[PDB]
């Protein structure tokens, strides 16, 4: 495997995630995540920022009881193949944040209005509670497997998330399960996977980001999170057609 520098101690490195991450999480929980000696699937470390060839069909079949990606394997490919990653990286990263294809937004949201963000409303107490709507021609269904443009829900506007999150999909064209798989392969490439500024090209870096200054920088705050996606891609492991990985792993400096 190549050897990424991470440049503090593995120590100096839990702690900077742990003051930094939103959520509270103890030391413990992260040093056995972020402790590449402790990583029992190597799936983490592989290069994703490379198509693989895998058996289509074998992958359509594998996704058997996954709600709105049963028997996907054609459009994850395809998408994996247009953005250049790993297409059971994929694969594995849509099914978690999916819930094997159950949230709603992933299932398919048929809507009657997108929102105008550029005009809020607010209480008469300064809290924004929702947005001039605009009305849509005929009702579309749109998809939006990430939750991107999601935004966060409040007490006083529940459903904020997915009004944003069903306009965001509408305004990129995801009105396909085919269209929102590779919005989502697109999504992670240019923004992790392939950026060259970031070259978060594995998962563990995508969680934990190689340059200390960039930790902000982070797919999720959960600290099994990559630990999770690679145990996901091991129930697919054999679906590929070639030999070809190739491993990235931390180093720390004590």
């Not at 997108?114 to 929702?130: F, M, R, T």
């Not at 605009?134 to 269904?141: A, D, E, G, N, Q």
């Not at 594995?202 to 340059?211: A, E, F, G, H, S």
């Not at 999720?220 to 091991?234: H, K, N, Q």
């Amino acid at each position: 495997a190549s050897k990424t520098n991470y440049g503090v101690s593995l120590n100096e490195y839990i702690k900077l995630q742990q003051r930094n991450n939103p959520s509270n999480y103890s030391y413990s929980e992260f040093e056995k995540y972020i402790n590449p000696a402790k990583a029992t699937n190597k799936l983490q470390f592989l290069r994703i920022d490379k198509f693989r060839s895998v058996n289509v069909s074998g992958l359509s079949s594998r996704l058997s009881n996954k709600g709105v990606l049963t028997g996907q394997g054609q459009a994850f490919v395809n998408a994996a193949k247009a953005f250049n990653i790993d297409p059971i990286y994929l694969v594995a990263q849509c099914l978690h944040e999916t819930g094997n294809g159950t949230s709603k937004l992933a299932k398919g949201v048929t809507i009657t209005e997108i929102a105008d963000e550029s005009k809020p409303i607010y209480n008469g107490n300064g809290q924004l509670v929702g947005y001039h709507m605009i009305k849509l021609s005929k009702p579309v269904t749109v998809y939006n497997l990430f939750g991107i443009g999601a935004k966060d829900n409040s007490s006083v506007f529940p459903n904020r998330a997915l009004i944003l999150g069903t306009t965001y999909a509408y305004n990129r064209g995801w009105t396909s399960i085919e269209n929102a798989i590779k919005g989502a392969a697109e999504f992670v490439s240019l923004n992790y996977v392939h950026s060259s500024r970031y070259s978060q090209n594995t998962l563990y870096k995508m969680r934990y980001n190689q340059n200390v200054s960039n930790i902000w920088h982070q797919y999720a705050t959960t600290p099994w999170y990559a630990s999770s996606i690679a145990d996901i891609m091991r129930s697919y492991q054999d679906l590929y057609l070639e030999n070809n990985f190739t491993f990235d792993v931390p180093v720390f400096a004590g």
